[PDB]
Symmetry: D2
Subunit: 434 residues, 4 copies
């Protein structure tokens, strides 16, 4: 009460009733559950990304525009089906639908393109090598590598991407007992992980999949690397317009577990309700994110994270701590590769991480990190570097004010570096919105 009394007088009682704030202020996890309220509405923008598998039900440019508006952040192309010609047309339709909103920063919404490989079916397959080369040639952002069983499998995928695919992210799919057992070595060499529950549920007893999902999500959260929860999340929506009680619960629990992304497979690739499936995941993720017990989560991420002498890492924890202290509406970060936004995201701030970048690939790939909202800055550089920096911060403060994220009177945390180029983030500023 006294630790929120002056902020309650300032922001009002109605502010503290929304986005499960009474449940977030609880002293125990049990009290946190007791304080969850169906009448407490989510205010924050949805932070868990939705990956939609693109197929016959979601191929058209008009349908893809509907899915972008519904919340799709990553388009998945399953190379276990179709052909190179089929997937190239899908890629072109996604890019056409994405560029139909390029007229403004207030309307632009980047969509990453992910290639899900067919898999080994011994080691790296010959069609996997051909498909990975297709991905490099078509400019894919992410590879969902099927049946990764050891660290050498991810090294083989990296080698097959060649020197031109150095920027592509490799998300290793854990689909069998070997992948689960060798998880630490796979995560160490991967950019992220996908909990591929379809095959995992056949390879290990179905009643043990939840243990593997929660363990992998927890370790990925500890490592600060993206983790995707996949397969049968809203399965019944392939034929029905509404999901089952188990399905909405599953989506909410994947977000509560700590998943950075949630996925739709047949629900969007072949189902009768692809847009509705995206809308449903969007709705559940917004509710589940507000119900996250940040008080224990942030304390545990701080206690578990080792000490660091990397200024980006040090600035990120100071910025997230500052954002929680004032209930900052957003954390605006300037990033080239997306790394500074990723280091902010690993501490799970409630404040939106608005990442301003000049890299179109980084803007698409940061969708893998929960709570990161990418803004592609296209303006030519200013003669004075410090003015160019300030212009990019103001671009985020304007796009944020104008897209609801921010309001006059709000506090924002601004994360920048001391010199140009990747790797120099070391400054945190507290700014009041006017």
């Amino acid at each position: 009460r006294a630790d929120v009394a002056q902020l309650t007088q300032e922001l009002g009682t109605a502010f503290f009733q929304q986005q499960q704030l009474p449940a977030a202020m609880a002293d125990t996890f049990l009290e946190h559950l007791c304080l969850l309220d169906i009448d407490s509405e989510p205010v924050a923008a949805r932070s868990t990304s939705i990956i939609a598998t693109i197929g016959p039900a979601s191929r058209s440019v008009e349908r893809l525009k509907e899915m972008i508006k519904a919340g799709m952040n990553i388009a998945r192309l399953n190379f276990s089906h179709g052909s190179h010609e089929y997937h190239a047309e899908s890629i072109a339709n996604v890019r056409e639908a994405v560029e139909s909103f390029a007229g403004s920063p207030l309307s632009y919404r980047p969509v990453a393109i992910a290639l899900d490989t067919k898999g080994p079916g011994p080691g790296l397959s010959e069609q996997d090598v051909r498909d990975l080369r297709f991905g490099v040639e078509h400019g894919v952002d992410i590879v969902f590598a099927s049946f990764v069983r050891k660290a050498s499998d991810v090294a083989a995928v990296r080698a097959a991407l060649g020197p031109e695919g150095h920027g592509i992210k490799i998300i290793s799919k854990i689909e069998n007992h070997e992948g689960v057992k060798r998880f630490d070595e796979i995560l160490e060499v991967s950019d992220g992980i996908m909990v591929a529950r379809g095959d995992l549920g056949i390879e290990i007893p179905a009643e043990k999949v939840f243990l593997a999902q929660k363990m992998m999500i927890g370790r990925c959260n500890l490592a600060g690397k993206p983790v995707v929860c996949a397969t049968q999340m809203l399965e019944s929506m392939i034929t029905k317009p509404r999901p089952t009680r188990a399905e909405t619960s599953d989506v909410a629990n994947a977000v509560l577990d700590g998943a950075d992304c949630i996925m739709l497979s047949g629900e969007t690739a072949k189902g009768n309700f692809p847009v509705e499936a995206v809308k449903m995941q969007h709705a559940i993720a917004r509710e589940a994110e507000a119900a996250v017990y940040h008080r224990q989560l942030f304390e545990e991420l701080r206690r578990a994270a080792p000490l660091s002498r990397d200024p980006t890492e040090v600035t990120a924890i100071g910025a997230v701590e500052a954002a929680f202290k004032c209930c900052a509406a957003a954390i605006i970060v300037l990033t080239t590769t997306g790394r500074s936004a990723q280091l902010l995201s690993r501490y799970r701030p409630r404040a939106a991480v608005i990442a301003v970048t000049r890299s179109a690939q980084a803007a698409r790939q940061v969708h893998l990190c929960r709570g990161v909202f990418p803004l592609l800055y296209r303006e030519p550089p200013e003669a004075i570097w410090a003015d160019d920096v300030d212009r990019r911060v103001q671009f985020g403060i304007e796009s944020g004010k104008l897209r609801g994220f921010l309001r006059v009177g709000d506090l924002v945390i601004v994360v920048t570096g001391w010199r140009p180029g990747s790797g120099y983030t070391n400054i945190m500023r507290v700014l009041s919105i006017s």
Copy 2:
């Protein structure tokens, strides 16, 4: 031994943080403990055969639900008789006999304001046929619970009333409903139509948490393994839903169409049994017990005081079980509210209490049938010995195990006050 500490997610249970607890979960760590979350199976055309109900009892069914929204009193009386016939077909082996509670799920009020006239007739049918529990549909306020209690009359004083929360009013008036109810059912089917579907998980977790705090049974119900009505295996979302209901703190999990009308009634029970054992081992008891202790108020009731001392003692020695003598089941319920990892073996002479304690997680009822000894202390020991012998036969106990024994100072209900540390011989 080292192998003991690698099983039942003991490395994950020893973790200092919840995050480290999740990281330490092991798919190769096998569950050793008996399944403690009760399975309620709805009876219907797919599960009325005496021989099919015997298979469901062996699979793990603990409570048989009679849905009074379907069928006549004649139909429900036959369900009751077939359940009792299947249950009594195992009474020849008293150390391995499993009591099965009978629950009457009411039709509800409909466009009505309170207790319907059909509900009054069905509630009286339940009292006349000896039902143990009432799952009262669409409870919206405390006066709805009082009307159900009044309709049960003086002969139904022992029947438990589990209020079903199925709409926004029930969720908003939850505290007053829980106060006058014996427990709650999160009726997700109607709740998911009455409130936005994407909010049901918030209502489920809130109600389970409050019930855990109150020490009253909470049931998670509807569509848990829905696809198993026609398919032999459930979806990844369904197994996750069952596991998460157990992790949330549900005392009971339910099957509706999966057992009443589906093609896999036995397999649906076996699947819930398998998931619940895995999920119970993954419970982070270190935080859970500390939070239940911190939140529970001080008490001057000896049953309540003995229960917390016994659960604390069970954790200190990794007791295989807590054997409790109970008349009404209340001493077992007060042990269960602290969520011990040790099984609560409840020895009772009341067949109704033996059936009703299935509402409390981790309570394993043993119905004692022997005629009393003339010396009271000798009769209490004979029942404790019966608890140990059944525990050994069922795999709960072995020679060398430590067990906590909970008894009272005089006969009759309400006098539990002793906790003793016992070594199994």
Copy 3:
């Protein structure tokens, strides 16, 4: 119930705090201590406190252990002091409200390498005169304790050896010394000369913490109320020092020159009594009990398992006392290690155990000398009732209070396995 006034006394608002910082903020000078003083006072007996009349005044002021410093005087001098202590103690054997057992402790002169020749003669004197405790000077390694143990000859294996840590070697080899000792004395006088004076507080807090972890008695000694050797009131630093030794976790606090040679021996005892009562109420039991619990390893010893269950039960109902039957004092010691707020009333037939349990904080001994009953269960009930009657007589209990009773299942030492919740009638 208990009333609002009950919850304002003995720093109960500060004890209910969720953080240690909030606990400090809630400390109230107007919140009066209700509980009996639980930290024992050791008074050094010398010229200023040698007379039978003066010793009677010191017993009334709160002296629990009489220390005889064998660094001064002779065997003849100390034998007269022992006889005067026993005479003063027995002058209250008619009044059950005034009778209090007083332990007799021999503080050795000290070492050279191994045990000194004078220490062998003095330890032999202690065995012949029936001393209860040995404060072994300058213990530096485990072999020093073994030498004292061997010197305690065939008739003295029951005497307790409290090793005095007085130098850098004793501090560095602390774990091996504590392992073989019955307890520790933080001998700050020599320690403050052997190591830098500004480091003594680190050694005191470390040794007290480790002793609390081990469940072994720890004494805080030297210059606690030094100025009271010549002045009737202590300094602000002295009262703070006594209070902080109690807050650190000391089982005993000591007076040296303050009682042996000073002008105000009775007043020094009265002052330590007054400060310890205040400091014990200010102990943050919520964190302390949770940390003692979390740090203590799992145990398969029924005495250790019963002790934690009993202390948990005592906290749950705000038990007025924990009555324990003990022949060696071990069951009372295992209760004391969990630092209950309830008084541990130890009923024993052993006069030596009754004197030695003063080393354990919160243990209030009662020597029982009635002839044994033919039925053991009746003999147990008679001693439990003796503990309740003495409790009512001394102010610990009233009709309507709840107590926790700790007994075992069969006679003789080592079988404590029972905890009962009893209502005072």
Copy 4:
């Protein structure tokens, strides 16, 4: 490792105590300020120079004794001794001057009005107001300091039952508190003073306001060269309780060993500060501190969190009034708070806040404000290196503002030394 780092890494307070090591040496600079009462035993300029070297940070003038002429000579001798080290600006130590009032005796007395006026005329930094028993007593002292004494700090002395009972209202209107144990131990039972001390220290820590522990801390050292075991324990426990300052009264004013008493408090405080269980302390201070929309308050918590993440050697903060350094100090960082200020009064007063090391900036301004700021930050680094706080390769947190003037702190920077 050094500075009780194994004990600081412990998961419980019990294991923290068990891990305390007498062989683990303190590395960090002493954070708890020492207030020494100046009198006949510590009046000479030569004696005062030795007390400054021993660790004296605040000179207390007890207006219950002596005269205005006597105390004016003491003030002049303190200033003379302090300025005798001004030739080396990177290692010069500011010393605050505090006036302890006589008190009301049998409201604000007429002698107190004259003494408070003396303090304003002589430029004192702090007032230790005797026998404060309600918020209106603080207001009367504030009024008696007139318009020329707006910048003096008022530390209310709690010396009786009424002051203890009305503590919250007194702390609300005061700059800080002094636990005046001498009178408090006569006004309330002696065995209850420790409860009042620990309660007041805790509440002051919560409020982020300075708290002084005073009277009889090393009493025996008035006549003996070494203190008793109870005295060293008392000093260590006042620091462990959370006191920002510790005081010497008769030990320095009339005692045979004034320099040794200061040296002893310095030695004990360094040991006690290393034994502080920061893991629990920071988590409790952070949890208890309310949410804030003030950028100085928000930057302060972000900076302390960042300092703990990298084991920052120091937090260099630019301050005009000392407020930005005070807001850093309230979170009890292990990193030294090096406060670079151009105000000489702020530099002296900032000794009331634990862990704040004031550096008086006596360098000429740079034309560009961004450059003036960078030279004040380089000044902090250079003094830190010279005084042993910093080494090349160390990480520091730099707390600066967006525009000049008090109240605009909003920037935290992670900087690598050289």
